[PDB]
Every structure is written in C-alpha cells, then in structure tokens.
Amino acid sequence: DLLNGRLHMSDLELVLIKAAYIPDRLQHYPIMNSKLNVLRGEESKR
Amino acid sequence: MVNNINWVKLPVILDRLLRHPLLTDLNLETAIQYTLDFISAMGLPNVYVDKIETIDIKEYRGELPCDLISINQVRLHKNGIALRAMTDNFNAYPTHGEPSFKTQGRVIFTSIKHEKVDISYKAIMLDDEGLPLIPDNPIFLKTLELYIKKEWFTILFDMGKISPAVLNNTQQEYAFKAGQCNNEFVIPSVSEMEAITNMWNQLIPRVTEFRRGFKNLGDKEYIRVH
Amino acid sequence: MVNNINWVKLPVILDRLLRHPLLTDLNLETAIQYTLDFISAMGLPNVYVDKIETIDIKEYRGELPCDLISINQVRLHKNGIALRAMTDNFNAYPTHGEPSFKTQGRVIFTSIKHEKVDISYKAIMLDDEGLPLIPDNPIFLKTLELYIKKEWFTILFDMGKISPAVLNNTQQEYAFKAGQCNNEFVIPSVSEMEAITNMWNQLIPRVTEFRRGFKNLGDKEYIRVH
Amino acid sequence: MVNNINWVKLPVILDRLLRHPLLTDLNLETAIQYTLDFISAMGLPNVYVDKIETIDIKEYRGELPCDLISINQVRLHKNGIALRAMTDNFNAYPTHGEPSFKTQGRVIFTSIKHEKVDISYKAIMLDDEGLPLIPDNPIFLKTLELYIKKEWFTILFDMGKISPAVLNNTQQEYAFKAGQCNNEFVIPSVSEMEAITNMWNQLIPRVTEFRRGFKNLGDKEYIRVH
Amino acid sequence: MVNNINWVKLPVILDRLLRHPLLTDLNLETAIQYTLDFISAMGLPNVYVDKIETIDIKEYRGELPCDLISINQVRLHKNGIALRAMTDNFNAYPTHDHKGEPSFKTQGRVIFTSIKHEKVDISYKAIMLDDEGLPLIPDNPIFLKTLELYIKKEWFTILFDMGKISPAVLNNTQQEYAFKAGQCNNEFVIPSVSEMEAITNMWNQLIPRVTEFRRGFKNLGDKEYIRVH
Amino acid sequence: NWGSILELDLSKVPKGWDVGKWMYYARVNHIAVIDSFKEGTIGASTGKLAGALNNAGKGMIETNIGNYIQQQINLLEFIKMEMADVAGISKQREG
Amino acid sequence: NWGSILELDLSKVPKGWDVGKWMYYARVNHIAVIDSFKEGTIGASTGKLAGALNNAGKGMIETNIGNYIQQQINLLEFIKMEMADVAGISKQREG
Amino acid sequence: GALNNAGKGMIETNIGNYIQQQINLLEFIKMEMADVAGISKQREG
Amino acid sequence: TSLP
Amino acid sequence: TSLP
DSSP: OTTTOOOOOOTOOOOOSSSOOOSOOOOOOOOHHHHHHHHHHHHOOO | OOOOOOOOOOTTHHHHHTSSEEEEEEHHHHHHHHHHHHHHHHHHHTTTEEEEEEEEEEEEEEEOTTTSSSEEEEEESSSSOOOOOOOSSSSSSSOOOOOOOEESSSSEESSSSSSSEEEEEEEEOOOOSSOEEEEOHHHHHHHHHHHHHEEEEEEEEHHTOOOOHHHHHHHHHHHHHHHHHHHHSSSOOOHHHHHHHHHHHSSSSSOOOTTSTTEEETTTOOOBBB | OOOOOEOTTTTHHHHHHTSSSTTOOOHHHHHHHHHHHHHHTOTTTTTTTTEEEEBBBBSSSSEEEETEEEHHHHHHHHOOOOOOOOOOOOOOOOOOOOOOOESSSSSEEEESSSSSSEEEEEOOOSSSSSSSEOOOOEEEEEEEEHHHHHHHHHHHHHHOOHHHHHHHHHHHHHHHHHHHHHHHHHHTTTTTHHHHHHSOOSOOOOOOTTTTTTTTTTTTOOOOOO | OOBOEEEEEETTTHHHHHTTTTSSTTTTHHHHHHHHHHHHHHHOOOOOOEEEEEEEEEESSOOOOOOEEEEEEHHHHSSSBBOEEEEEESSOOOOOOOOOEOOOOOOEEEEEEEEEEEEEEEOOOOSSSSSOOEOOHHHHOOOOOOHHHHHHOOOOOOOOOHHHHHHHHHHHHHHHHHHHHHHHHHOHHHHHHHHHHHHOOOSSOOOOOOOSSSGGGGGOOOOOOO | OOOOOOOOGGGGHHHTTTTTSSSSOOOHHHHHHHHHHHHHHHHGGGGGEEEEEEEEEESEEOOOOSOEEEEEEETTTTTTOOEOOOEEEEOOOOOTTOOOOEEEHHHHHHHHESSOOEEEEEEEOOOOHHHSSSOOOOTTTTTHHHHHHHHHHHHHHHHHHTTOOOOHHHHHHHHHHHHHHHHHHHHSSSOTTTTTTTHHHHHHSSOOOOOOOTSSTTTTTOOOOOOOO | OOEEEEEEEEETTTTTHHHHHHHHEEEHHOOOOTTTTTGGGHHHTTTOOGGGGGGGGOOOOOOHHHHHHHHHHHHHHHHHHHHHHTTTTOOTTTT | OOOEEOOOOOOTSSOOOOOOHHHHHHHHSSEEEEEETTTHHHHHTTTTSSSSGSOOOOHHHHHOOOOOOOHHHHHHHHHHHHHHTTTTTOOHOOO | OOOOOOOOOOOOOOOHHHHOOOHHHHHHHHHHHHHHHHHOTTTTT | OOOO | OOOO
C-alpha cells in the first residue's frame, strides 16, 4: 500500500483518523515508486 | 471577548463614583449622558445588541428600524445575497447589476425598486425603563468611572477648583484603563481564535465571504487525501 | 502556576490593610468592590473555578447558568464536537453547517435548533456567605493590599490629604507587584511545561485540538521505529 | 545552593531588627506576616521541606494534604507514570490517553476514576510551635530584616515620619540584597553542577525524564568503545 | 588566594572601629553579628575550615554534623565513588511493584541519600572557632579594613535613619565600602603562583578530562603527559 | 551542542488565556495576539518602572559551539592529509 | 583550545524552578521561560540600582585560539614547500 | 517644523516578494511531479 | 515624577 | 531620586 499510494497513519505514529481529510490525515508522496521502477525497468531490458 | 456580558443597570456606576467625596454632585442625568459618550467613544462591538429585522423597500427606499445604530449587513430576502454599499452618484435618477445600499438617517436607499431585505443591525440593551443597560465587567466599570471622574474633574479644573496634578493623575489613570478596556472586549476568546485560525489557514483561499452573511468565515478548510 | 490556590476569606485582606493607620476607615463593603475590580483586572484564569453544565437549546437559543463569567468551550452533548464561534450575521433568520455559538447576556445563540450542549465555564468561588474567596498566596495578598491602598490614596490625593511623593511611591509599589502577581499565576510549573513540551515538539503536527476538548494538547507524539 | 539550610526560629529576625531604635514597635505577630510575604515574593525552592504523600482518587478526585503549597509531581502508584497536566475542558463529564491532573484547592482532579497516586509536594517547615522556621543564612536574614524594615518605613513615610532620602536608601539596600539573596539560593553547587554537566553533555539526548521522577536527569551518559 | 589566612580573635576589629569617636558604642555582641553577616555576604571559601566526617546512612537518611555550613562533596566509604545530587522527586518512596547511581540531598541537619545502608564521607566547611565559642577572623588587612567599613556602614545607616549623620557621610561610607568590598573579593579569589599551576594542567589538555567529580577532584590539576613517538 | 535558546517572558499573553492554548495557536497561525495594556504593564506605561520592561527584544542563551565543531573538523582534514603525505599515499593514490 | 564560554546569570529563572530542570526544558523547547518581574530584579526596575542588571545581554569568554592555529597550519605549509624546493623534489614530482 | 519637510510618503505593499514566493513554489512542484512519473526536463527535450 |  |  506504500507503493499503491495508501498511507496507514497507525504505522508511523501512535494514534491518539478514519476520515480522509488532510487537516487530520496526511498526504502521501510517491517518492519510492520511481526508485523501484528503474530496477523493474532494467530487469526486463537485461 | 473572553468574558460574557452580564448586564447591570446605570446606578451601578454611581455606587462607585459617589464613593469619592468630590464627585458627590453627580446625578443619573449626567451619567446617562456620560455613559452614552463612553459607549460610543469605545466603539466596542460586544456592547451592542445584535438584532435582525425584515424591512420592505417601496421605490429604492425603505423605512429603517428605530433603534438602529450600526448596520452589519443588508441581504435580499428572497435570494439571500448581500448588498454592498452604493458607490453610485445617480442611484434612482433616470436617463432620457450587483445590488447596493446606502443609509443616512431613518432611510435606507437601495438600488432595487420593490423588494424585501433583511437588516442585521446593532442596538442598545435597555431596561424596564428606557435606559441604557451596561456590562457588569469591572474593567468596563472602572474606566467608565474614571471617564465621568475625568469629565467632572475637567470642569473643576477649568473653574480653578482642582490642582493641576489631580487632573494630570486622573488623565493618566484613565488613559491606561481606556487602553485596557479596549483589550478586554477585542482580544478573541479560545473559541473565537479557532474561527480566525480556520480563516487564516486556507490552502485554497476563500475570498467571497461577503455574499454569505460571513457564515463560512470560520469553517475549517478540509482537503482530500490522495 | 508553580504553587497552589489555597482559599481564604475576604477579611484576611483587612488584617493586612489596617496595619496602615491611613487606611483604617475601610470596611468589608469597600473590600468587596476593590477586590472584584482587582481580580477582574489581573484576569488570572487560576483564580476562577471550573464548572461544566449541560443545558438544552430551544430554538437557536439557550439558558446560561447564573454563576458564569467566561466560557471555555461549548460542545455537543451527543457528539463531542465543540462549537467554534458565530461569525454569521443572520443566524436563525430564514430566507424565502459547522455548529457555532454566540453568548451575549444570559442567552447563548447557537446554530443548532433543538439540542443539548455542554458548556465548560469559569465561575467565582464563594464562602459560607455569598462573598468572593481570594487566594492565600502572599504575592496576591500583597498586591491586593496595594491595590486597595492605591485606590484609597488616590481619593486622598484628589482631596489633597496625601503628598505627591506618597502616592507616587504607592503607584510604583503597586506597579511592580502587579507584574509579579501576574507572573506568579501565569508561568508554567514543572507539570504544566509537559503540556507545552509534548505540544511544541511534534514531527507530524496536530492542528485539530479544538474538536476535542483540548484533551490531547499536551499528549506526547510517539514515532514508531523501523 | 552552595550553603546548607540550618533552620532557626522567627525571634531571630527581631534580635536584628530591634537593634534599630526606629523599629522598636515590631512584634512577633508582625514578623510572622512579613516573613510570609517574603518567602512567597522571593519564592526560593530551598526553604520548602520536600514531602511525599499518597492519596486515594475516589471518582476523578482526591483530597490533598493539609500542608500543601506546591506540587512537584504526581505519579501513579502501581505503574509509576507521572501525570502531566490537565489540558482538557471536559474531564469528568461524559457524552451521550495519557493521564493528567489539575489541583485547585484541597482537591485534585485527575483523569483516572478509582486509583491511588503519590504526590511529591512542598510545605513550610514548622516549629515546636505552629510557626514557620527560617534559614539562618545571613544573606537571607539580612534581606528579610530589610524587607520588614522597608515595609515599616513605607508606613512611616506615608504618615510623614521618615525623610524621603531615608526610605530611598532602604529601598536601595533591599533591592541589592533581594537580588543577592535570590542568587544565593539558586546558584548550583559543585555537587549540583554534575547533575547539569551530565544532563547537558549528551550525545544521545534524553528527552523523557518526566515519565520517571526526574530521577535520571543527572545520570552520566556513557558511550561504549567500538 | 595568594596570602596565608592567619587567624586573629574578634577584638582586633574593635581596635580599629573605636578609633572613630562616632562608633564607640559598638560591642562584641554587635560585632559578632556584623562579622557573620559579612563573612556570609562575601562568601570567600578560604575563610572556612575544611573538615571530613564519616556518617552512617540508616534508611536513605543520615544525621549531619553540627558545625557544617556547606558540603563540598559526599562519597562512598567502601568504593570512594562520589555522589552527585538528587534530582528525583520520589526518592525512597516505593511503587506497588515494591520496586542506578548514588546521589544525595541535604536540607537541615539531615542528609537524604539514594543508598539505604552505607557509610558516606562528607567533606564540608565550618567556621573556625576560638578558645571561646566565637568566630575566628582572618589577619589580612584588606579583610580587616573592609570589615571595619562594613560595620561602619550598617551603623551609619542606623544613624542616618534616625537623622544623626549627614547624607554625605553615609554616601562616602557606602562608597569606600564598595571599593574595598570588591578589593577583598579580588584578594581572596585570584589564584596563587602555586594555584595557577593547578589551572594550567586542567586547562591545557590534548585529551580532555571530564570525570574529575567521580574522583575527589584529586587529579583536577594534574599534568597530562603525552608520550613522544 | 544544543540549539539557540530563546529567553521568552510571558508577561503579555492576554487575559483569560492559558499559556498552552496561546502557544498552540501561535504555532498554527504564526501570529501571537498579545496585550500590551495588561495590569502588569502599568509601570512602564505610566512611567513608574523602567521602560525596558516593554522593549529591547527577547534575549538569546546562545553559545557558539558550532564554530568549535567546525574548527575540529578543519584539523581532521589537516591531519588525515599529513598522515597521507608521510606514507606517500595521497588521495589520488587511493582512487 | 576549548570553545567560547557563555557567562550565564540565573536571576531570571522563574520562582520555584530548579536550575537543572529549567535548562533541561530549554534544551527541549529552545524556549527558556524567564521571570522579568522577579523580586530579585526590583533594582533596575524601580530605579534604585543600575539598569545594567536588567539589560545588556550576556558576556563571552572567547579567546581567539583558532586564529592562532591557522597561523601555525599556514607556517608548516610554507616550510614543507621550502624544503621540497631545496631538495629539488617538488610536489608534482612527489605525486 | 515637519510641515515644510519630511518628504513624500509611500503607500508600498511588498507584493514583489509574495508573487516571487509563489513562482518558487510552483517550480518546486512542477519539478517534484516530474520526478514522480520519472519524466525529467531532459526527458521532454 | 517619572523616568526611573 | 532615580538614575543611581
């Protein structure tokens, strides 16, 4: 779900939510997808 | 404002003033005038009573309520959209849009002929008598007491009946409590600061709050998660 | 506050005042006003007692308790969602959202028609009699002794019964203890700094503490290890 | 503090004051109050005896010990976790986290229903009589003598029985000895600078000492050799 | 301190004060208090005597000596490990689990340690006494001149509140005390030629020593020799 | 090396405001509503106390340990270079 | 060479606050709450003492031993450049 | 004496910084969205 | 007077 | 007097 663009707010902190709004939840930024897709783009071209 | 306004009558301020043996010739009649001079000169919006009334417009003109002091807004009754003030120099005058209003006395001058408007205005809280009803807030009471004392000591200084250092100290003791009484009634509460924080923190800015009656001004601005 | 607020009656301030023989005409009637003017002038939220009362809203209006001074918060009794502030000019008033409140006198004007709400408010702590109850804290008592001394010496200086150097010392002896009593009652303790430390140091910032009753404000923000 | 607090009685301050032939009408009664003004205005934490005492929280509430002045910490009895501070406005009030406390009078409002908590607090050290016991440190005793001198000479100056340069010299001599006595009781010793040397000098920061009883605050942080 | 602290009895200070004909009603009783108000305000540690005493801790508590003023260091009698200071608010108080580093805390005639049953050595400071039970003052005539001026300053303040001394006489005594009370502070503090060697070894260190408090500050001034390669 | 420490006096947080809820709204707004006409400010306003109780800005408890860190770093790059030259094994010798 | 030493006066640490815990919460928050209306600071505030007890900031024990180090570093570079000329074995001939 | 002097005042609001602060923020996100798809500025030219 |  |  990190690669599919979903953030689990219970994974990176102690929760003290269930509504998808950035004043309480957090925007996820797909900076790890581009690193993995070079290596799956080279395995095919090998 | 942090504190609620508890209302108490005008002879509360003469319990305080006639503790002073030089202010013992004050009546309610002077304090009726000197409180209206203090309620006005402070301009505090938490002292006036918010009332809303529907008035109807005959031909670009409507009769205004009798207790009006300051208009907050004037909105149309059928649409709900609010009227800006009128910049037009030639409003109802014929030759050979976004609607607007204007008020001078007991008249409101509109840009529309035959309609109904709502008026959100401010008035004074009154009594069983027809008298002003003032806050119980002992910072409003203490600078109202120093106001009427400063205006009675000025007459006694002009007459030559008060030393220059006694008017100088009252003018200093009042001028602190006038700047303090400003800050009591102005500084937002913990609840009024969330209405500002949700207005000051806007990723997508809301710039058309006047079309509504400033209803969505303090709404928290939610953004969807992707 | 590092210390605690232990209560004593009003006439403890008259044990302290009448050591000065130029103040030995003061009463319990005179101490009541000049303390309530004082307690309000400092505006310390540690002196007031916190009470919570569920009221019911009838139609955008509700009845407020009799001992109230300043509302901390209003929340919904069924949800727990707190109410922000009424920025609407046209609250109940129909033409042809987020819940809010506005309290002017003994009336609370909400934007919900028929509900029950919890009002966390601050009141004055009282005696066996119905008289206010001051802290025993000898900084508060030393500056309430100096406040009633400053307002009595002002009356004498206007009467011309006190030299300018005597009042100028009391105006200065008060002016230092008025800041010290402010700082005595405001600066956080070793326990109230942990409400600030867990709030200041945050990696994912919390910005919605008003929806809760400011409950999770000083909660520590833990990060998982990976 | 470098020196130790060897306690002596309250008549020690009148061996020193009645050396002055103008202060010969001070009593033990007046030395009692002017000591209590002086302990609280200075607010030095070495003069308070540190006591620990367990209470029983009945329903979000427990009584508080009769000689309490200031709470250092409150912790749970079974776990040991210190309670931070109550930031909530709606603590005991239900609708239709980390623990916390709030102490106003002789009662402590916790967020836990039925539990025991240990309170580490501060009291006044008493005597064989019920009178406060003062340090014999002659920086403290000299400026406590000058506080009783200054508050008495103020009283004489308002009556007109003291030259204005005599109170001005006594206000000057106190203002140095009050800041000198402050620094005598707050400058750390060699034994307490190690508890700051080990706290300040940390490669891996310890930022959670409040969960403990501030116990490991002075512990040296050792780093292995690899 | 550069000079040696020789001890003289208290009537040396009344040789000097009663040279002034305005201070002739000074007594030993008035000079005993004004000496102790002075010694404490100046706070020079070379005026106190260095004493070492072993006391026994019973239950996180020990009974402290009578003549103590201030503790330099406490250590353990078996290890020699020194104790730092108690920052704990909850020292000997057990949880209902009935559940690291030695530390101590001192308020009155009692010491509050973090150890239960052990002997501790306390290096403290006292007042040096006479044959009589009176304080014994240094011989240095910077100390005796500024003690003369301090007793003259507090006596003349009492005459000025009565109105028996002109304001220019107190203002001159407050000035002449103010210089000699700084000159006495600089005399009793500024280290010797022998005591600046103990600071030359501490300040100049290629490999820093940061644990002298664990010892009795014994090697604070020891030379840090470096091998030649 | 800890950071730069601000000496902040809370003499002007307004009346009826806790220090926590004032600072919590001070993070999120970057705007702190203050109150210069508080009763504690009657001295420097009316002129009975020193006028520096209203002004001169907030002091910093700030030591320059960053300059001491940077001095030790500029010595390690000096001595690792001198050990390189003595052996005759430079940096281009290693790469 | 030790760093700059900041001279700290603790006369504005608030009432009842330990100096161990005051500095600890100053490491954390970078905000050191101070008490400008302490009873110890009645001297400059009332005008009975000098105003330099409530203002002027903090003093530094700084000794410019780092400028002295860079002079010794630049003197070893000059001699090692000189001796490489005397032998006729330069730096680009050593490299 | 300021009625013959003191110069002419300016009603100047610094919206030169506010307009420039936006353009530095758009160019940070147009770069950041380029790295997400893996399509650089060199990749489009 | 003023200015302390 | 002030300014000492």
